[PDB]
Design a protein around this nucleic acid. Structure first.
Ligand code: K
Ligand code: K
Ligand code: K
Ligand code: K
Ligand code: K
Ligand code: K
Ligand code: K
Ligand code: K
Ligand code: MG
Ligand code: MG
Ligand code: MG
Ligand code: MG
Ligand code: MG
Ligand code: MG
Ligand code: MG
Ligand code: MG
Ligand code: MG
Ligand code: MG
Ligand code: MG
Ligand code: MG
Ligand code: MG
Ligand code: MG
Ligand code: MG
Ligand code: MG
Ligand code: MG
Ligand code: MG
Ligand code: MG
Ligand code: MG
Ligand code: MG
Ligand code: MG
Ligand code: MG
Ligand code: MG
Ligand code: MG
Ligand code: MG
Ligand code: MG
Ligand code: MG
Ligand code: MG
Ligand code: MG
Ligand code: MG
Ligand code: MG
Ligand code: MG
Ligand code: MG
Ligand code: MG
Ligand code: MG
Ligand code: MG
Ligand code: MG
Lengths: 107, 50, 49, 29, 31, 49, 94
RNA sequence: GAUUACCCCUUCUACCUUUUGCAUAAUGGUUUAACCAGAAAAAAUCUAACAAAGAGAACUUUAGCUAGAUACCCCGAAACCAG
RNA sequence: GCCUAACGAGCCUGGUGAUAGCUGGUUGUCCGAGAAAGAAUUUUAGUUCAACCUUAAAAAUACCCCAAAAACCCUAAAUUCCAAUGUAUUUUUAAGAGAUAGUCUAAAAAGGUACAGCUUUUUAGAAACGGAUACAACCUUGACUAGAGAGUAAAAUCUUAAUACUACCAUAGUAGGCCUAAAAGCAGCCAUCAAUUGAGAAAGCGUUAAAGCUCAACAAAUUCACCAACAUAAUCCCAAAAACUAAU
RNA sequence: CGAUGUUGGAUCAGGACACCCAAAUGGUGCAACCGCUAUUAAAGGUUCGUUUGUUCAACGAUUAAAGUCCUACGUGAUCUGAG
């Protein structure tokens, strides 16, 4: 888990500041896999495939993701307009590229 | 056998996939395949595999 | 198909995903008063919130 | 099932065959 | 334990000689 | 045969359907001068009992 | 004319089914995705020490709510309307 | 599944029993009508009466006693004994 | 043997609804959860416990789990134990039956022929109405109903089928010593010097021994030249066919 | 195992080629004759008797040759029952 200097430019990461939140999407199936991988999927909220779920970037969560890193797709969460306020909670929409748009389809 | 292993243009190698447990391949591979690096299968040794 | 192209442009992989073809109301009264909201649209706006 | 070491080039699991075919050596061109 | 860094801290058999016991049938001054 | 098979079935008509009797005649001339690719003139064999 | 002895997918002698060009591409596509998976996990935002008990009140509250909901299990109230509503079976038009 | 159209087209390895596994070339049935196979309340749970007491005698009682409701198949041997 | 068409011991009635761990059968709809074997047993064709599971109830902690920690000669994959964190699970009490005849794939071993669709254990997986043409075990898959909507996953013809090496030219000491019936470059032993610009007391063939042919060295002259070859089965071969109009 | 009838012959034979004969050919320690060995070819053919239930084997006579093997070691809802 040591990134090469060229990895940051390839994946669009930030060399200095790591991202803050995860977006985890399950791809493969828990079937035909050992039982300990099934429990980790269940306890991460990834029961239903192709449904994005947001998790922290703390080492405690990353410890579980490394076990099932071959069954999920992980993308950073980008905030073009910043964190939503209490006024714009109902207008939030999550795009495919991995950014959260606070104001979606105004007027 | 070292020059052919240094100039290899294939990004993925048996050593990289097996050790990192990519694609959950450890369920198919044997624990001895970590050291053999895929060059040994049973008693048969294939020198052309990198 | 062509889901890879749609992902590149920023749209959803499936044309039914948060597109303008789905969010907008499909029918309205002739006089102009708004139609009651869809059951699906209300549910979709609840999980986003 | 057969032993770990045999005399007849033990046939690999199909998933392993794909692994042996994707990790080939490509000489520089 | 094997994986612990303090493995083999109790090793002593390599400090003293083997000291082969004088067996009843093998008792001989093998010089 | 590839293009002749399509015409016989009617797979070129947008009104195609297996139940319907859509079908077109095909006339092939100069069949003595066909050119088998490779050494298939001596290797391919047609067998019947 | 040529048969595969026994079952064709188990045993010492199997079917010679080879790996196709499509199968090779499927492996690579999954490998590229997993290569990206292990990069975003490389650099955490917080270290191991800085996350020591950062969110424990919420965890404690969540467990307390679970105990509260599970401790409310009790038979529901019984009212006179339920028993006296059975007499409406023989309601008539006089 | 359909279709203007019965077929023509496309898609589907009968049913029970018995087994690790049955379209199996393992078992049984030509088909129809009639007849033919889950039964017991000691401890328990649910509802109710009355309660340090309950029960229309005889008993049980450190919240118990009385009452109700909830339960456990059919066909078949070679044999054995007496008259 | 025969004793009323069946006698290793008649027939009939009664005991009799004899008794079977053994075989067969077990009748309306719909819904919820759902188990492959550890221990004794005239016991392994069965039962009774434990584990697991169902229904009801009470309670608080269960899984994941970092550092620390678990043997002395050498010793892999990795387990045990535990805070955080992620997540709702787990324990206890009261009632219970079924199951206790297992198959393959990958991995660590044992018996065998480093044989079996073989057998005995441990860890893990599965038992699609999709894919591998057919297919219990391999791969894709969180199994609701309706629609003449849409995006995707596993996945469809696999490689090579390979090896030409051809000019020109040979004379000295000398049958070198030894050896042997005879050993003249050419059984063996020993030495391996030396004429000629050029040629080994000899690389191969040959002779009883010689003779003779050929290869190294002259000159002439100059594409390249390590290696890579492997028979057949019994009813009738087995989709048909295709080397380029743009493919993450 | 609520049955897949079991050796040999008789009848009829289907097939493979790792060919016994018949046809073509290479090599030889092939002069010729008689042989040994290898390649190619499966349309046809591959005998009659004594003893044994015999397949097998021994022996007599002959033939261009009396091939090897599969087919539920073919074939008993066609026969034979010696074993
Ligand atoms: K097999
Ligand atoms: K049967
Ligand atoms: K049976
Ligand atoms: K039956
Ligand atoms: K028994
Ligand atoms: K000599
Ligand atoms: K039988
Ligand atoms: K013949
Ligand atoms: Mg095995
Ligand atoms: Mg088979
Ligand atoms: Mg295979
Ligand atoms: Mg089947
Ligand atoms: Mg069986
Ligand atoms: Mg069973
Ligand atoms: Mg049947
Ligand atoms: Mg049976
Ligand atoms: Mg019948
Ligand atoms: Mg009672
Ligand atoms: Mg008695
Ligand atoms: Mg009697
Ligand atoms: Mg009688
Ligand atoms: Mg009975
Ligand atoms: Mg058992
Ligand atoms: Mg039990
Ligand atoms: Mg630790
Ligand atoms: Mg804990
Ligand atoms: Mg049992
Ligand atoms: Mg088993
Ligand atoms: Mg087995
Ligand atoms: Mg067995
Ligand atoms: Mg298991
Ligand atoms: Mg299929
Ligand atoms: Mg679903
Ligand atoms: Mg020369
Ligand atoms: Mg041959
Ligand atoms: Mg065909
Ligand atoms: Mg039958
Ligand atoms: Mg015969
Ligand atoms: Mg014949
Ligand atoms: Mg031949
Ligand atoms: Mg001949
Ligand atoms: Mg027979
Ligand atoms: Mg017979
Ligand atoms: Mg007869
Ligand atoms: Mg017959
Ligand atoms: Mg007889």
């Amino acid at each position: 888990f040591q990134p090469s200097p060229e990895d940051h430019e390839k994946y669009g990461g930030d060399p200095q500041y790591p991202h803050k939140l995860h977006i985890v999407t399950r791809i493969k199936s828990t079937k035909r896999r050992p039982y300990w991988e099934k429990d980790i999927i269940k306890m991460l909220g990834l029961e239903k495939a192709h449904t994005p779920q947001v998790h922290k970037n703390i080492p405690s969560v990353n410890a579980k993701l490394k076990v099932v890193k071959h069954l999920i797709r992980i993308k950073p969460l980008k905030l073009p307009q910043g964190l939503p306020t209490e006024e714009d909670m109902a207008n939030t929409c999550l795009k495919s590229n991995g950014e959260l748009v606070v104001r979606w389809l105004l007027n | 056998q070292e020059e052919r292993e240094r100039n290899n243009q294939n990004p993925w190698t048996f050593e990289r996939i097996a050790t990192a447990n990519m694609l959950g391949i450890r369920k198919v591979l044997s624990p001895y395949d970590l050291t053999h690096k895929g060059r040994y299968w049973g008693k048969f040794y294939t020198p052309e595999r990198v | 198909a062509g889901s890879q192209w749609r992902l590149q442009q920023g749209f959803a992989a499936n044309p039914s995903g948060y597109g303008p073809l789905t969010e907008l109301p499909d029918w309205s009264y002739a006089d102009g008063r708004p139609a009651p909201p869809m059951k699906g649209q209300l549910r979709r706006k609840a999980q986003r919130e | 099932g057969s032993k770990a070491v045999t005399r007849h080039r033990r046939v690999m699991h199909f998933e392993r065959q794909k692994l042996m075919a994707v990790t080939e050596y490509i000489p520089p061109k | 334990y094997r994986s612990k860094p303090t493995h083999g801290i109790g090793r002593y058999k390599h400090l003293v000689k083997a000291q082969e016991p004088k067996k009843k049938k093998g008792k001989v001054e093998v010089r | 045969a590839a293009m002749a098979s399509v015409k016989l079935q009617g797979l070129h008509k947008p009104v195609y359907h297996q139940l319907s009797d859509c079908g077109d005649h095909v006339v092939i001339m100069n069949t003595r001068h066909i050119a088998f690719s490779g050494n298939k003139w001596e290797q391919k064999v047609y067998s019947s009992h | 004319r040529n048969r595969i002895p026994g079952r064709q997918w188990i045993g010492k002698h199997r079917r010679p089914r080879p790996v196709s060009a499509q199968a090779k591409q499927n492996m690579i596509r999954r490998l590229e995705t997993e290569a990206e998976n292990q990069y975003w996990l490389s650099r955490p935002f917080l270290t191991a020490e800085q996350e020591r008990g950062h969110a424990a009140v919420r965890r404690a509250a969540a467990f307390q709510a679970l105990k509260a909901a599970q401790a409310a299990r009790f038979p529901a109230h019984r009212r006179l309307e339920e028993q006296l509503g059975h007499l409406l079976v023989t309601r008539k038009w006089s």
